[PDB]
Amino acid sequence: EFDREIVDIVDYVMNYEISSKVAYDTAHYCLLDTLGCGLEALEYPACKKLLGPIVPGTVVPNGVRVPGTQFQLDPVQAAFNIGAMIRWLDFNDTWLAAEWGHPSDNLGGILATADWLSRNAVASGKAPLTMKQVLTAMIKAHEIQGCIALENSFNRVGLDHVLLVKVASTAVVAEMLGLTREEILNAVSLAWVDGQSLRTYRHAPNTGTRKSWAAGDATSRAVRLALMAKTGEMGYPSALTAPVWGFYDVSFKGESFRFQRPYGSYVMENVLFKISFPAEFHSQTAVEAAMTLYEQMQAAGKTAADIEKVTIRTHEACIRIIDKKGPLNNPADRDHCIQYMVAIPLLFGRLTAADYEDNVAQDKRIDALREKINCFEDPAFTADYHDPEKRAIANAITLEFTDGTRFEEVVVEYPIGHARRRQDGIPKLVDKFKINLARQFPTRQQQRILEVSLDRARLEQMPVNEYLDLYVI
Amino acid sequence: EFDREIVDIVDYVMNYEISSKVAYDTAHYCLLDTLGCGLEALEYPACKKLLGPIVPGTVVPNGVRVPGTQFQLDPVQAAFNIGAMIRWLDFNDTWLAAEWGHPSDNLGGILATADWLSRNAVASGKAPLTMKQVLTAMIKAHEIQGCIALENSFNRVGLDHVLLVKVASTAVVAEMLGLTREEILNAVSLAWVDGQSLRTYRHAPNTGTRKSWAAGDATSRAVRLALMAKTGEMGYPSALTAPVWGFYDVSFKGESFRFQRPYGSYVMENVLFKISFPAEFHSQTAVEAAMTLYEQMQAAGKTAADIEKVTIRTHEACIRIIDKKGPLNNPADRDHCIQYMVAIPLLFGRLTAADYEDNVAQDKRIDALREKINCFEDPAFTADYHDPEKRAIANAITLEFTDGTRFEEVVVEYPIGHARRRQDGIPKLVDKFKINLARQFPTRQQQRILEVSLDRARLEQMPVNEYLDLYVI
C-alpha cells in the first residue's frame, strides 16, 4: 500500500546490482575526497565545537571511531560528526540539478552505521563489513538523492535539500542494518513524515553556519529513524500521497515527484569534484580558458592592458547565477562574478581565493577590464548543459585587442572537476587528499592511509573498522 | 534584529515573575499527574521498545535517571524517553484552543535537562536545581505553547502541534542552561528554522504509534538545539519574517502569528486533567449528568427502559466532534459518540473502557436507548466554551419517561477535570497518581514518593536529582 516512490527506493536499495566500473571508481575517489574534507574541517573551531558526544566522558561499547579525533560515539551522534565535518568547508562533491546538493553527505550515516556494525561483529567474533559495502551504499545513496533532485526542486517550496539526504541515508542505512523489506519501507516513510528544515540559513540576511551542518544532521536523523524501524516501529504507507496530510499537499504544493529515469548508478558516474580554482562552478571552464589566454598572450608579447573587449559565450545558468556589472568589495561579489574571475587570470595569470577581497582588488583593470566583459548566452552550450550524456559547463572567451587583431576564442566544454576530465582531475583530487591527510597525521600515518586508500582492490577488502582505525589519533 | 515574536518569548522566559498561587498549585499537581502517566506507559511493550539508550551498554557520566526504569541517558535521549512515556497512553493534561495540545509534554525536556544539571552540579560540588525550578519551567513552557496555540492553528497548515512543544521547550531549556539572552534568542530561532513534523500519523489510514512519541521527540529536539546554542552556535533573526525563506511564507501561508494575550500563567491556570471516566472531553459533562440521572432514576424507581426521550442541550464543538448517529463498529467509534457514552451511564450506571468493546456493544438496549438520544446546540453554552474566563464544556440532560413525567434538567457546565472543579478534581487526580505508582513500584516506594510529592514545601526545596532517585528501579 506504500506509495510507488517509496517502494521504488526500497526495492532499488534492496535488489539492484551495480555493475559499472566507472560507478565504483568514482565512488572510490569520492570517499577519499570526502574524508579529506572532513580532516580539513578539523582545523576550524566553529566546526569542532559541535563535535564529540552530547555528554563528554560518555563511553559507548564499540563506538564509531570518528576520523582525526578521539571520539567513539554511538552510530547516530557519530553520523552527525562525520556528516558535519565532510560538508563544513563545502569542498565535497557536488550534484547540480533541479535541486542542488552534495550526495557525499550521506557518507555520515553510511560510514557511522558501517563502522559500528563492523565493530560489533568483530566483537562477537563475526565477520565485519568491508569498504566495498560502503562504496556500494554510497553509489546507491547518490542515486536516490541524485535522481529525485533531477527534476524535483524543493528550494522552490522553501525547504532545504538536506531532506533528500535524510531519505537517501535512511534507505541505505536501513538496508545496511539488515532490516526486512517491511521494516525498510517503514523507515523511509518515517523520513518523509519527519519534519523538513527550511533554507533560511542559506539565504541573506540569515546566512549562518547551519548551512554547514544541516546535512550532517539530516543523515544523522536517518540513522535514528532507521534504528527505530529496526525496533519494529510502524510505517505510514501514503506518507507522500495522503489526501490532505501527505507530504505532497502539505509541503510540496499539491504537486508530485517527477522522474526522468529509474534508479541506477548514473549520479555517481557524473558527480562534480571541487578540485580546482576557488571560482564558482559555472565559471570553471571560463577560468581555465582565461589561463590559456594568459600564456598565449605571453608567447605573443601581449599585455592584459591591450584588451578592449572580451565577449564570453557562456550557458544558460551562468549568466543567471554569476554576473554583476558595477563595482563590488565583498566575497559574494567577486566569488560570484564571471567577469571578475576571468579578469584576474588575464591580468595576473592565476586565481587564488586570496583575490576576493580589497587588498588585491585595487588595480584599475579590477574595475576597468571587468567593464570590457560581455557575457551573453548561446543555445549550443545551454543544450549540452542539460544533456544527460554531457552535462557540460562550457565557456568561450574572445580577446579583442587594440592592435586590430583578436585572439582565437578559446572554448572549454568540461571543467577539470567534471566526469569527462578525470584524466586531469584525479591527479588534482589525489593532491588535495594528500594535503588534507597531512593536516592531521604524521608523515608515517599519511603513507599508510594513502597506500591503502589509493589501492581500490586492497581497500575494498578491508573491514570498515580496520580502515577507519587508520584515522585514529 | 530578532523577530518580535522570538524576542517576546525570550524576555518572558528570562524575566517574567509568576505571581500566581493558582499557577504554582496546579503546576504541582500537573507534575505528579504527568509522572504517573509515564509509569502506566512502561507496561506497554510498544512504548518501552523505543526507550533506553541508542546503544546498549552505553555509560553516561551523571546521566539522567529516567523515572520508572534503570536507564541513565544523556539529556537529549532522556528527554525523548520521558516525553514518549508521559504522552504514550494519552492520559496527559490537555489545552483546547485554536490548536489542541498537551503542554505537559514539555516536562520531558524540562526534567531531563534539570536532572542532568543537578547531577552535574553535585559531581562538581556546585548547587543542584530544585523541583521548584522545574515547577516554574513548566508554567513557562505551558504558557509559550498554550498562548501561541490560542489563535494560531498549525493543524490547518499541515504541520503537527508538536512544533509548539519544540519551540516552548527550547526557550525554557535554553534559559535553564544559563545561556545569555543572545544565546537563548539563537536557540528559539534555531527551533523555528527547524523542520516541523507532519501530522500524517494522526489521521487514518496512516494513523500510527508516532502519534504517541511525536512530542517526546520534539522536546528531545529542543534539548538538542539548546545544547548547540550553548556552544555558541548562531541564530537567525528573521527566522519567521524572512521574505521567502522565513517560516511564515514557507509554512504559515505568508500569514503572521496572532496573540490574543501576552505570556503570563493563563495556560497552567486553565489546563484540563484527564481524571474521570474514559470519555472525550466534550462529553465528560454529559457522562457526569447521566451518572447523576441514573441514581436519580433509582430513587424514583425507574430504569432506562422507562425513558422515551433524552434531550441533551450542548455546545457547538461537542456537536460537530462527537455527535455521531448511525452504527458503531470498532470501540474507537463508540469512544467518540456522545449518545453512546451517555447511554451506558443511564443503563449500567458506570463507564469504563471495557464498556466500549463489542463485548458490551452487543446489548441491544444501548442502541435502542441511543435512538431516543437527541442533542441540540445552545448558543449560550457555545459562548461559555469560547469565553476565556470560562472555557466551559457544558452539557445538560433532560429525561422524559413513558410514565408521562420528566426529570428536572441536570446541568453541568465544567468537567470535573476543569480548573473550576479542583476541589473535586484533586482527590480524584491524586488517587490516579497513586494507582500509577502501584503499576511500577512496591508498597514502600509508593509511600516514599507520595509523601514527598504531596508535601509541596518539601518537594520544592528538594534537589531535582534527589527526587528522580525515588522513581529509580
UniProtKB/Swiss-Prot annotation, chains A, B:
Free-text disruption phenotype from the record: Cells lacking this gene abolished the residual aconitase activity of an AcnAB-null strain.
InterPro entries recorded: 2Me_IsoCit_deHydtase_PrpD, MmgE/PrpD_sf, MmgE/PrpD_sf_1, MmgE/PrpD_sf_2, MmgE_PrpD, MmgE_PrpD_C, MmgE_PrpD_N
One Pfam family linked to the record: MmgE_PrpD_C
EC numbers: 4.2.1.79, 4.2.1.3
GO biological process: propionate metabolic process, methylcitrate cycle; tricarboxylic acid cycle
Record GO terms (molecular function): 2 iron, 2 sulfur cluster binding; 2-methylcitrate dehydratase activity; aconitate hydratase activity
Swiss-Prot/TrEMBL induction comment: By propionate, but not acetate or glucose. Expression of prpBCDE operon is regulated by PrpR, CRP and a variety of sugars such as arabinose, galactose, glucose mannose and xylose.
Catalytic reaction equation(s): (2S,3S)-2-methylcitrate = 2-methyl-cis-aconitate + H2O; citrate = D-threo-isocitrate
Broad class of enzyme this protein falls into: lyase
Sorted UniProt keywords: Lyase, Tricarboxylic acid cycle
Pathway stated in the Swiss-Prot or TrEMBL entry: Organic acid metabolism; propanoate degradation; Carbohydrate metabolism; tricarboxylic acid cycle; isocitrate from oxaloacetate: step 2/2
Function (record text): Involved in the catabolism of short chain fatty acids (SCFA) via the tricarboxylic acid (TCA)(acetyl degradation route) and via the 2-methylcitrate cycle I (propionate degradation route). Catalyzes the dehydration of 2-methylcitrate (2-MC) to yield the cis isomer of 2-methyl-aconitate. It is also able to catalyze the dehydration of citrate and the hydration of cis-aconitate at a lower rate. Due to its broad substrate specificity, it seems to be responsible for the residual aconitase activity of the acnAB-null mutant.
Entry-linked NCBIfam families: PRK09425.1, prpD
Family: Belongs to the PrpD family.
Record's miscellaneous remark: PrpD catalyzes an unusual syn elimination, whereas the addition of water by AcnB to cis-2-methylaconitate occurs in the usual anti manner.
PANTHER family for the chain: 2-METHYLCITRATE DEHYDRATASE (PTHR16943:SF8), 2-METHYLCITRATE DEHYDRATASE-RELATED (PTHR16943)
Subunit structure: Monomer.
Name of protein: 2-methylcitrate dehydratase
Organism encoding this protein: Escherichia coli (strain K12)
